[PDB]
Amino acid sequence: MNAPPAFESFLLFEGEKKITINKDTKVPNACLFTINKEDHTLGNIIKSQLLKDPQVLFAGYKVPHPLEHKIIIRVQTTPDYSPQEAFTNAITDLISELSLLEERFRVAIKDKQEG
Amino acid sequence: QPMIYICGECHTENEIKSRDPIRCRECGYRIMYKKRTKRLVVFDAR
Amino acid sequence: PYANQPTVRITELTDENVKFIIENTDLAVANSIRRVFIAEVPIIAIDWVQIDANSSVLHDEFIAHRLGLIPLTSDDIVDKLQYSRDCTCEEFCPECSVEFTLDVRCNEDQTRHVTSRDLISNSPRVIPVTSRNEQDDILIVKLRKGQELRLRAYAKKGFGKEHAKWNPTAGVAFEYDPDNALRHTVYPKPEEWPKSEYSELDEDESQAPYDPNGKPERFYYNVESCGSLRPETIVLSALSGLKKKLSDLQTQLSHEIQSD
Amino acid sequence: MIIPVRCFTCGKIVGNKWEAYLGLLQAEYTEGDALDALGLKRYCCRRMLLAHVDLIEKLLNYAPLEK
Amino acid sequence: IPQIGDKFASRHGQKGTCGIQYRQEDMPFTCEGITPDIIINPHAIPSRMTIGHLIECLQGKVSANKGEIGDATPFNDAVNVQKISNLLSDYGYHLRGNEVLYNGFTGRKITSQIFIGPTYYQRL
Ligand SMILES: [Zn+2]
Numbered sequence: 001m002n003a004p005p006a007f008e009s010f011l012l013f014e015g016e017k018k019i020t021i022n023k024d025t026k027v028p029n030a031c032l033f034t035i036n037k038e039d040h041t042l043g044n045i046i047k048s049q050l051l052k053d054p055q056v057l058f059a060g061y062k063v064p065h066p067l068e069h070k071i072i073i074r075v076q077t078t079p080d081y082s083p084q085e086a087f088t089n090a091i092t093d094l095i096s097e098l099s100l101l102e103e104r105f106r107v108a109i110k111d112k113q114e115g
Numbered sequence: 116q117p118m119i120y121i122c123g124e125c126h127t128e129n130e131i132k133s134r135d136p137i138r139c140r141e142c143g144y145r146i147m148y149k150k151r152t153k154r155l156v157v158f159d160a161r
Numbered sequence: 162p163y164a165n166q167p168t169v170r171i172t173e174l175t176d177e178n179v180k181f182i183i184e185n186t187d188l189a190v191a192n193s194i195r196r197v198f199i200a201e202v203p204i205i206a207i208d209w210v211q212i213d214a215n216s217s218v219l220h221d222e223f224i225a226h227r228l229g230l231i232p233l234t235s236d237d238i239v240d241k242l243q244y245s246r247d248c249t250c251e252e253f254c255p256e257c258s259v260e261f262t263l264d265v266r267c268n269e270d271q272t273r274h275v276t277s278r279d280l281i282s283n284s285p286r287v288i289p290v291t292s293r294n295e296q297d298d299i300l301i302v303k304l305r306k307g308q309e310l311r312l313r314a315y316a317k318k319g320f321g322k323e324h325a326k327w328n329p330t331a332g333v334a335f336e337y338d339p340d341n342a343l344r345h346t347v348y349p350k351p352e353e354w355p356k357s358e359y360s361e362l363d364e365d366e367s368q369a370p371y372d373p374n375g376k377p378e379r380f381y382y383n384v385e386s387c388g389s390l391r392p393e394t395i396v397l398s399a400l401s402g403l404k405k406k407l408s409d410l411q412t413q414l415s416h417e418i419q420s421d
Numbered sequence: 422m423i424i425p426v427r428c429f430t431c432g433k434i435v436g437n438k439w440e441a442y443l444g445l446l447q448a449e450y451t452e453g454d455a456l457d458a459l460g461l462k463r464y465c466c467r468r469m470l471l472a473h474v475d476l477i478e479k480l481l482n483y484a485p486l487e488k
Numbered sequence: 489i490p491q492i493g494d495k496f497a498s499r500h501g502q503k504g505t506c507g508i509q510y511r512q513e514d515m516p517f518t519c520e521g522i523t524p525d526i527i528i529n530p531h532a533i534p535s536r537m538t539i540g541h542l543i544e545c546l547q548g549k550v551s552a553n554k555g556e557i558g559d560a561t562p563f564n565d566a567v568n569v570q571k572i573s574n575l576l577s578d579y580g581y582h583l584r585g586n587e588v589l590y591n592g593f594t595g596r597k598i599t600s601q602i603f604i605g606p607t608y609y610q611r612l
């Protein structure tokens with residue numbers, strides 16, 4: 001009667017942007033990234049990778065409503081740095097980490113099956 | 116057009132037209148069931 | 162400001178589960194990997210049923226739901242098939258779906274067990290796991306003499322976010338800091354609690370001394386497979402899927418940055 | 422009415438274990454040892470097999486609608 | 489199919505509607521990846537004093553781990569909480585039915601060890 005289709009958690013609606021960047025006016029060098037059709041899976045890793053950047057002053061995320069299917073990630077960096085650049089570097093670092101983890105898991109599987 | 120029904124007691128496929136008392140021709144039982152439609156109903160296995 | 166250099170150590174690899182350890186990674190990465198095991202590792206499962214005849218004691222949706230939860234071998238085919246969203250065909254085609262047929266009739270006096278062995282596929286690679294060449298076959302329905310079940314299913318590509326039938330795991334044990342050194346738990350009576358299988362403590366010692374400078378490292382995993390994928394295929398597909406989620410996110414990020 | 426396919430909690434397949442479970446029980450296994458023989462180690466799957474009531478066997482005592 | 493707003497009840501007067509449904513990766517999990525089918529609020533216990541709910545949960549954990557059916561007949565001196573706890577401690581569990589759970593969203597351990605186990609629920 002009121003059950004949303006299960007794909008609405010993963011699929012973007014037509015004309016809906018995957019990610020939107022909005023300047024935070026309260027403090028300088030801060031941005032809000034509203035990412036649609038993602039959840040804690042990417043939010044937590046992006047936040048925790050951003051916390052590894054010493055040029056990042058704030059890194060947090062929230063799912064504003066569990067029934068809704070977006071996350072907001074707030075990133076504040078030092079003045080010489082940018083929150084968009086920080087977010088990009090965090091994603092790049094996560095991708096490199098996962099590539100290395102995948103190659104090493106392939107090697108470990110090969111060793112385990114062989115000996 | 117035929118509207119074949121099944122008997123509740125003898126399970127016999129028998130045709131009955133409108134304005135006809137509901138009686139199985141094989142055993143006279145008074146309760147009949149319609150057969151499953153031929154239309155194509157789809158289920159999401161969820 | 163840069164990526165981790167995680168290492169891996171697989172401590173057990175069977176056809177049923179994989180038990181491994183990831184070290185030198187963040188807890189968020191470990192838990193996102195754990196979540197992707199459950200919710201973003203695609204597999205093949207029946208997601209469309211057409212009942213041509215069902216005289217069984219279970220109604221049509223019961224049979225359909227029951228067929229959807231039968232695991233189908235998805236190892237090499239799931240990467241090749243497309244989502245029906247992405248397929249440029251009609252409702253179905255062999256590029257985005259797999260056809261199954263089931264046609265059973267109980268004529269004999271003993272009860273006929275309509276099992277997953279009766280799910281006949283057009284694709285030899287995508288078959289019910291129990292039907293793969295021990296464990297018995299999954300029971301779809303029991304039929305009495307004169308009862309009959311004839312249906313036509315189509316299996317699709319999906320993951321556990323959409324429905325648990327596309328979840329490839331039969332349990333994902335995840336653990337870290339087996340000895341409570343980070344004190345992320347606070348036992349009122351630490352002596353009362355059993356020791357983890359990964360604990361390295363003498364029996365007199367209940368929990369490790371508190372580590373003020375500690376961070377969660379060395380996450381232990383036991384990924385049990387429902388049958389569709391091999392456990393190591395579940396882990397590899399999870400890592401690839403998480404990496405493609407991040408890559409797509411970065412692509413859209415670049416479009417948003419350059420459009421500003 | 423019939424043995425579920427998956428364990429509600431973890432999603433382990435239990436549909437193929439009901440008949441084997443009954444065969445082990447008539448083989449003079451205890452329910453715990455039978456559940457151990459089938460590889461149900463989490464108490465959720467043990468719940469699934471141990472608390473199941475096979476009502477379909479009673480529904481098959483009624484003649485079908487068509488012969 | 490059960491949904492938000494459907495009424496469920498245990499056998500102890502503990503009724504309530506489904507507030508929300510989380511997927512298995514969003515629910516909290518034990519070290520062996522068991523997620524709860526249902527999560528009920530601890531504040532429903534103290535004023536109500538439905539200790540039978542807790543004893544049934546603990547007895548049910550013992551029953552599921554032992555392969556038997558628990559005897560909850562009302563006035564039975566051969567079955568008390570200490571015996572059930574001693575039985576549960578033999579299966580590698582905290583004797584009082586608590587377990588370390590992990591946050592499904594972040595994977596961090598929950599500081600307070602949660603009371604979890606099989607309980608017979610009813611859909612109304
Ligand atoms: Zn008749």
Ligand SMILES: [Zn+2]
Nearest residue numbers: 248250254257
């Ligand atoms: Zn197609």
Ligand SMILES: [Zn+2]
Nearest residue numbers: 428431465466
């Ligand atoms: Zn289970």
